[model samples]
Target: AQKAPAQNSPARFNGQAAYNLTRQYIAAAPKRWVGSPGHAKAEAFIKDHFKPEIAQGRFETDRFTAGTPAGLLEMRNYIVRYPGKKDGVIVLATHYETNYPLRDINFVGANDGGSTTALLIEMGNYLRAHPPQGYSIWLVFDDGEEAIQSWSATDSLYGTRHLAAKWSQDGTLKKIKAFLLADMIGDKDLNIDRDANSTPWLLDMLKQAAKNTGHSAYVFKNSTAVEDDHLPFAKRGVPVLDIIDIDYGPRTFSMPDGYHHTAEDTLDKISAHSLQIAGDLFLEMIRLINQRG
Candidate 1:
């Protein structure tokens, strides 16, 4: 098959490359819970990947500490910006830290943390090579997404909550055109849910992007409300979309039976084709969002 230019196109997303990135990332730090050496290593690895942007004054780290059930601990949010000709910014974000509760199980988070981390890293590589023509694209590697004790309204999503609140005070929230969050999307059996919490139009935009890329068969087949990293932005009035595949791995009798937050969430469960689908849809969603404005 013939191919289009990589600049500003879904063709720029390479699934196999992303898969390799995922593998290498988990290999570098297998268990990335907050306060662990593995978490710091993963953070450093991510920063090293964006050294060019760091040198260019386009890299920033939102450093803060949150009082978790484990006591106060430092958390960071790494942000890399690629300016567009337009005034607004489109954020592509994902949490990079593995679950603090699942720390002992060696939760690699291959699909949860590894997949989207690599996907956004690859997207960053694409943007650096071929910058966006419309809205500025910002890649946010937010840390501390997992709860220290358990998932709850107050415990989970530590990084995004801090960033969203900070941005809201500094007038950064107003300049955001869209905030797209990807989580648990690299399962071999990929089925993205139509998140009821996401802004309706943004969900529609993702649907249209899936249709445009001939990936409609794998998207929005079901609907659910997810309390993920997107909630903080949505609460701040930012137009947000949570592109997640909650149904990860093969089905079982119990709820959350897959490799979700367990030791089974290893590299074996991740799929390159699934990464490609999410990446393509993400690129297309960016295009569609820019076109609408």
Candidate 2:
């Protein structure tokens, strides 16, 4: 709606692009819950989306096993990369799987899982169209974020837990400079809080980026910590920033809402303006990170 990234700047971080793609991801599958029918199709869809990009850097698959759904399930992850001048990396991560148990309830995850994944895909494409310098950017689409039963230490975070340790063991963790994560940014009432658990410096950078992009009204706020996908990397001592909007349809900053993990979390709850705000802020943050390196 209101000119994304900037009215005069080059093509970057278009909110309409993110919003449209989010709907496509949600519609591409009936349910993106781990081990569900739609889950497999979604995986194929994403992989197919990358194979044709000859010049947009290579895409890699990361697979691991997890005891989810019934007995065990395989979590599939994806990464779209733009190699930088150095070995140091910056990861922008989001989960693509909806809550596994919510399969019976018709949850599409338009916000919780879809929005950020759509944003990640667009960011990857933009990076491909106009490559980066200094630090490499890895757009990671993590799977199996929701628990097979309920949210817990081990029952949840399948992709992040597996990859964090996988990367650590593979010696890639040491090369990561920062991890910027986005979740539920497509809510109609978008209010991204500064997660207290996040690294202060990186959080400040997000705060500054929101202000720099004139989206300060949406992001800068006081909130409690959310143990999200960023935790795995944070536990490994990677400086991480969780840019999330915990309150979806609620009028206030409260937790455990029905809007988040409900069938109500559909396309109607998302707004193009909100997506634009989020898109611009992230681009500014990327520029800031680029400036640093």
Candidate 3:
């Protein structure tokens, strides 16, 4: 008997391609700790157009001094706007600056800083082509998120604090409806539990996004709250959602063994499947928000 040849599966959206693009961008090479090369590359990656289906407007770049140790260290933030009839704003942020080792070595930060940035850039490209008609988008690449030692309110979130303070005073914060901060979101087994502090509406949005995108398995009911860039905005009455993977198994305390502040935080630790799932959910959120407005 002759067996029939296998037929090709119907073509579906390429989530793996989107995820691989993120990993490739992060692992391309070592980005500078705090200088032109790193900042330039980050900006170029975010500003570059990837899809023609969406329309991207002009982006504005700003560098602010977050720390002063004699010579100030600058962090770059890029605003990507897609003009619309409505005036609501959605802020998607991630730090792009890598940590500097005590012995004068640069941390590649493939998962720490790299993964989130790459993911956001991919999102930016998607939004650019799709052109959501209700709300404007601001994709911020924050700097100075890394601290010398343990995370602290004063030392860490420098860029976020500065931006929040400035925006509060300048009336920019008033225009924003909500803020979503993505940090360390590329873990192989990413589990984004529900943040207790996040507004009910936002939490619902996250869960709904996961369900709609076939990523409900990654969404957990309970999530431990941790301090990150979102704290500053939350303090100022802005609804903030911190999407971070703090549960990296039992090695959460030590270095190398855990996912934090180690050389092992390379691209190999990142999961392309996880990135794509998250990316799809994010795009869904943007679309929903725009539609609502």
Candidate 4:
């Protein structure tokens, strides 16, 4: 068997490690809602690990101010850039914010924010060790993805909207090969559908990656175009694939998908196996991308 290097490093990407990270995220702050103390802690933890890279100028923060209902707010997006061996790039992304109203109702969003956030953090380890061959890569931890007001076009996609437009303005859009956003994938019964809005070629590649890994069941297949973080990038003509499983809310004989926004969407509902599968699928996707381009 090929031994994986580093036990507790981000390069490991093991499910158990991912699970512990998720738990640690919740413990960092049960209500890591936007701009909260817990949210700050989570960001600090992420920045702390990536600081060495930032210090070396391998990473940068895209800082900006947004006018929200609460008032003018400072929001930031972390970009961990792996200026690989080439010019083209692929960006992996996710939001780290738990929903607002859910705080009043015990919604911690362990599966929603915690799963993918931890996954990306772990991926930082692997990419640092073996970067892309023909293209660069960016791991984006986007802030303020949840709607403070409502799930409107402008209200929701705060970080992505801002960054995408800025990238577009600076002509950074041309270098992007794809934007892959993973969301709500930590469900215990994770069945990731092909997002309706996903570019077919990109989705096919990911599906093929899953099939090759024997993890096809999780990324099984989409109903409608999900209005998610990927929307901004997609609109900019960046090939985007939204990897999400929308079926949630506690299972019943009638409702088997399980919880979405309530406190029921807590740590217990997420499985270590689920984290492992998603993490492996992503690694496979990256490998496939590297091989072909």
lDDT of 1 by residue, 113-216 (tens): 89999999999888888789999999999998888898899999999999999999999999999999989888998989999999999999998999999999
| TM-score per candidate | 0.95, 0.91, 0.83, 0.89
Off by over 4 Å in 4: 1-13, 251-257
| Stretches of candidate 3 exceeding 4 Å from the true structure | 1-14, 27-31, 36-40, 47-57, 68-71, 102-106, 148-150, 249-257, 291-293
Tens-place lDDT per residue, model 2, 1-293, is 66456455556578898888888888887588777789998887677666645344478889888876468787899988888887688899989988877888988888888888888877876787777766888889999877888788978888999999999999999988889888989888888987998999888888788788888889866588898999999999999988899877764354358487878899999977888888787778877887776
For each predicted model, how many residue pairs clash, with residues at least 3 apart or on different chains?
0, 0, 5, 7
Sorted on TM-score, best first, the list reads 1, 2, 4, 3
Query: 115-218, model 4: which lDDT tens digit per residue?
Result: 88887877776677766665787899998888887778778889999999999999999988888887877778888876778888888898898897799877
Every candidate's CA RMSD: 3.6, 4.8, 7.4, 4.6
What's the residue-level lDDT of 54 in candidate 1? 93
Better of 1 and 4 by TM-score: 1
Shift of residue 29 alpha carbon in model 4, Å: 2.5
> Which has the better TM-score: candidate 2, or candidate 4?
2
Candidate 3's residue-wise lDDT over 50-138, tens digit each? 33322433566666876634256767766566555678788888887776442155557777777788787777656655665677777
lDDT of 1 at 254: 75
Residue pairs clashing in model 3 are 53-129, 54-128, 54-129, 54-130, 55-128
Candidate 3 has its poorest 10 consecutive residues by lDDT at 49-58
The TM-score between candidate 1 and the true structure equals 0.95
Lowest lDDT block of 10, candidate 2:
48-57
lDDT of 4 at 83: 82
